[PDB]
Amino acid sequence: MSQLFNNSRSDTLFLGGEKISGDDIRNQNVLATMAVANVVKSSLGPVGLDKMLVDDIGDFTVTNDGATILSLLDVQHPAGKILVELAQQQDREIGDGTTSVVIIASELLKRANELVKNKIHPTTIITGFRVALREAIRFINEVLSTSVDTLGKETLINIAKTSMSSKIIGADSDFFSNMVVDALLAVKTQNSKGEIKYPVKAVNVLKAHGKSATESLLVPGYALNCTVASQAMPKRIAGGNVKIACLDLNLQKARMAMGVQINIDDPEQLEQIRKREAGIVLERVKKIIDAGAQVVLTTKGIDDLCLKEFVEAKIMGVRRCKKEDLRRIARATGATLVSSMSNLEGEETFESSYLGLCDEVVQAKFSDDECILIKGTSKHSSSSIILRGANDYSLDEMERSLHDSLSVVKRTLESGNVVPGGGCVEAALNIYLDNFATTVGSREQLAIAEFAAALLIIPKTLAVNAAKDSSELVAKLRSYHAASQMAKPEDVKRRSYRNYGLDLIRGKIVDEIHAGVLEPTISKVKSLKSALEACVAILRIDTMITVDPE
Amino acid sequence: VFMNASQERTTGRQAQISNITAAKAVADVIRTCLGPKAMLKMLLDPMGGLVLTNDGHAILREIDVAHPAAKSMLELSRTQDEEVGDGTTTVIILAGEILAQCAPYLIEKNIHPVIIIQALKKALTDALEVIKQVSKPVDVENDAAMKKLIQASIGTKYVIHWSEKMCELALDAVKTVRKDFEIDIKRYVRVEKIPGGDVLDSRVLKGVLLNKDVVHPKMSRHIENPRVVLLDCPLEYKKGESQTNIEIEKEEDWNRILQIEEEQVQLMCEQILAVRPTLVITEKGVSDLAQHYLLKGGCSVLRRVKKSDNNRIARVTGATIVNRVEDLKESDVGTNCGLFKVEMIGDEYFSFLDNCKESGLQKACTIMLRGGSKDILNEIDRNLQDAMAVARNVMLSPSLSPGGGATEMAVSVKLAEKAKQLEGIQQWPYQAVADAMECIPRTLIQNAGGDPIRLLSQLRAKHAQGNFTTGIDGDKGKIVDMVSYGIWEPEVIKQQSVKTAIESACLLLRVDDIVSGVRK
Amino acid sequence: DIRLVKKVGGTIDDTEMIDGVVLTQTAIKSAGGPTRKEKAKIGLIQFQ
């Protein structure tokens, strides 16, 4: 919307690029905001559609997550990097509401920029947003609903299906619902003296393309992606109480410390010194084999020198794997991770307490890839999910689709209070802020009234991607929510409405409780706070100064 | 300007149209590659070689296609190959037609893609039940039944003339690798090829075929009962991890250094002679000093061997790889070797190791092939990998699906009957699936030179009344039944064709906009 | 004397004053060492 550029003044000189001041900066900030905003508008909601990006090497990426889309876009505009880093902050902390926080923060900038031309001061505009946000949080606490009279895991099953919507797994969300709920409950641990916490990424995601996505098997235990060192080793361990050895010590021919220079005056010493180099490693592996360990995990590669004794003893060898993957194996099976093998005494020894326990250790071949399936852990339970699709590019989307579903369920068990989703909160916050600021009024009434209509961009965008009539659905959301705000808590009726609406599939207003769509209260909070700081930082900028690189 | 973006942005309905047109062109090239009369496609690689095959997997692999949507069709080739290995051409043709036939709408009806996706998920579930009902189980222990089953993938290839000989090579190769459930893998099957010769003279021989001649002239090239021992360590003098740096004060110490190097290697040779092996195989290079003490005791020396061949030799003779010479024992020495011989061929020498054939570890075997040139060998090798993969599905899945296009047409008839009973808004996407399933048997008619209008009209009518085994004849282009046609195909091949094609179509329907050249 | 430690992410409302020394550096954990020690004596090692 910027034409004629700007006239360079000779009385004002600065090294580097020219300095632009006035309304041109806020016009370019909104122009740069709507550039990244229109990308995530079509990807929002179950009726939304994602976009594709070319990496210039021929490979592409198909994902519905707004964080990955903005991460792949490198924005040269200074204020444009705020919304890009806002999506990376959203999925890292809460893990949900990534597309919504970008659209909400975009509408806050579009409406506030139009208010600046109204001559109201930006700090008064910011004050209107912060005062309205303080009361909006109090309204979120009033609409909280604690799960009660629910049968089994249906509470977590219905909430997990909300995050599965808008993504390729939404059609299969019925089958994938039981896999995600059972995945985070198996990794359940205890910390902070009684506080329940869950690990992130602890559930392994394996990519094997074949069969169908509905046939994906849920392994009752951890699965590790690695290839066996020697093909002569058994791929299946029969019998219970399988001992797993988690070790960071590789078995290889190793050079002595660089600060040592061997000087020998006799040729006869060349036989014993060369033999002892391999003999030192033999002392460590000999005590491990005598302990009866069936599977020995190793962080670093193992040369064929020590792999001979593993074949005779029927011990399965392992080579380089991720360091963070071997930690949860020892904790689940009861083993203790050993970075360097040593004892309190000055003599080397091996204790049986460092060996894990499980039901069995088997290696299953999915397509042409081979992975180890560890089932029936002893000390702590674990889980893994093997995603199946038509091509590897669909598996890349299902990984982020599964990772986003784990973050929503993780925040669900931390706070028992949940709020209805599907544009119900955004429609409820509009009317609550309409009656607000009417008592104070004065100048701040206009800035607060625009903040209420700014949250309407979320429910209106959902109806556009569905190829339906938006004004018909928006008029209904304002009809039920408006008249019920004054209700007195007896004679019932009344507030029984306003708790539901905006169903994109059938285009009708239906109850979200019977539908099953719900959202955690953690995803709603901190989303407007992060979107506010992104709006305040950009709105306060009168002048942008660019310096040419050296 | 802003970031990396804009240029020409394709938005609206034309972004999905560009995805349908580009993906449709992928199946149009290999459209003539389906059927027994299918032609061949010659490919030109940047390396300077030549690839001539009718298999859609190898055709779409070497061809470089630059397009966001069209590359997704290229990835579907390795989905059918790595999971099964048969039907790669059928999946691309089916998935290419589904996107065009099942979703022409949104150009006209303006139907949302997810609404179509919800109908494709219900159509995939019903399509699997139809295949299960038309599938008749077959005995896996019948040798005569497995021969006609392997010829299914052979009928569309060039080896159909040798199909009587080819079924003998594929049956003995899969049965040997099969280990007792009955899990086999092609990593132990050897693809090694012999240039020239007669195809009828090619036979599967147990053991590993080595290209290396014996090292010393006095090494026996004929042994009745060879005893093989595998050594990973080289017979040369190991320098060590750290430098020795001998300080020699007196002139007598330097001669002892070179004297021990002869005695140190001799010490490792004396430990080998304890088990008196007839054939010694070393993974790394061997010194000319170590071969003398091994020749005196009767041992045989060979050239350095790759790690891939060491695993196959240990399976044939039952030997165990022994790195440490001092730990070598008689228990790890390979036995039960039928014959050891070396035949002269102008290109290279060839060493033969025969198995005594008489539970334990799975046996390994190599497939010898005599072609007319170097490129003909690579074509039959791809034909054997497709033919031997058929025997893997019947062993794990005894169910046997109808072939000759009868599987896809049987689903199209059942979907048309349930389309009118379903009604609703999903009737159009659900009924459009039956139109995409009948394109595969329609291709068989176009390649045969018949009239697809009159043949497919009588095919649907005779399918309900006559039987579910009615299909299109490849050679005569007539209406025949698969019962008298004598050739069938496993169900795993048909299940992978329906699942992969539908699951891939749902990915392209969700595409909104396309942005190219963002960054690396 | 006042030490202001910066941490990426979060909100401004989360800013609060600590009653003791805040360690900007993080532990090793490569060997699986305890990250929480109750009633412990903090030492300083100037050697290696």
UniProtKB/Swiss-Prot annotation, chain A:
It comes from the Eukaryota. One of its GO terms (cellular component) is plasma membrane. GO terms for biological process: chaperone mediated protein folding independent of cofactor; protein folding. Coiled coil: none annotated. Pfam families: Cpn60_TCP1. One of its GO terms (molecular function) is unfolded protein binding. The modification N-acetylserine is found at S2. Keywords: Acetylation, ATP-binding, Chaperone, Cytoplasm, Nucleotide-binding. Its main location: cytoplasm. SUPFAM superfamilies: GroEL apical domain-like, GroEL equatorial domain-like, GroEL-intermediate domain like. It is found in: Cytoplasm. NCBIfam families: chap_CCT_alpha, thermosome_alpha, thermosome_beta. Belongs to the TCP-1 chaperonin family. Heterooligomeric complex of about 850 to 900 kDa that forms two stacked rings, 12 to 16 nm in diameter. Molecular chaperone; assists the folding of proteins upon ATP hydrolysis. Known to play a role, in vitro, in the folding of actin and tubulin. In yeast may play a role in mitotic spindle formation. This is T-complex protein 1 subunit alpha. It comes from Saccharomyces cerevisiae (strain ATCC 204508 / S288c) (Baker's yeast).
Swiss-Prot record, chain B:
Keywords: Acetylation, ATP-binding, Chaperone, Cytoplasm, Disulfide bond, Nucleotide-binding, Phosphoprotein. Its main location: cytoplasm. Pfam families: Cpn60_TCP1. The modification Phosphoserine is found at S242. CDD domains: TCP1_gamma. Gene3D superfamilies: GroEL, GroEL-like equatorial domain, TCP-1-like chaperonin intermediate domain. GO terms for biological process: chaperone mediated protein folding independent of cofactor; protein folding. InterPro entries: Chap_CCT_gamma, Chaperone_TCP-1, Chaperonin_TCP-1_CS, Cpn60/GroEL/TCP-1, GroEL-like_apical_dom_sf, GROEL-like_equatorial_sf, TCP-1-like_intermed_sf, TCP-1_chaperonin. It comes from the Eukaryota. GO terms for cellular component: chaperonin-containing T-complex. It is found in: Cytoplasm. GO terms for molecular function: ATP binding; ATP hydrolysis activity; ATP-dependent protein folding chaperone; unfolded protein binding. The keyword Acetylation applies. Belongs to the TCP-1 chaperonin family. Molecular chaperone; assists the folding of proteins upon ATP hydrolysis. Known to play a role, in vitro, in the folding of actin and tubulin. In yeast may play a role in mitotic spindle formation. Heterooligomeric complex of about 850 to 900 kDa that forms two stacked rings, 12 to 16 nm in diameter. This is T-complex protein 1 subunit gamma. It comes from Saccharomyces cerevisiae (strain ATCC 204508 / S288c).
UniProtKB/Swiss-Prot annotation, chain C:
Heterooligomeric complex of about 850 to 900 kDa that forms two stacked rings, 12 to 16 nm in diameter. The chain holds residues 193 to 240 of 528 of the full protein. This is T-complex protein 1 subunit delta. It is found in: Cytoplasm. Belongs to the TCP-1 chaperonin family. Molecular chaperone; assists the folding of proteins upon ATP hydrolysis. Known to play a role, in vitro, in the folding of actin and tubulin. In yeast may play a role in mitotic spindle formation. Present with 5530 molecules/cell in log phase SD medium.
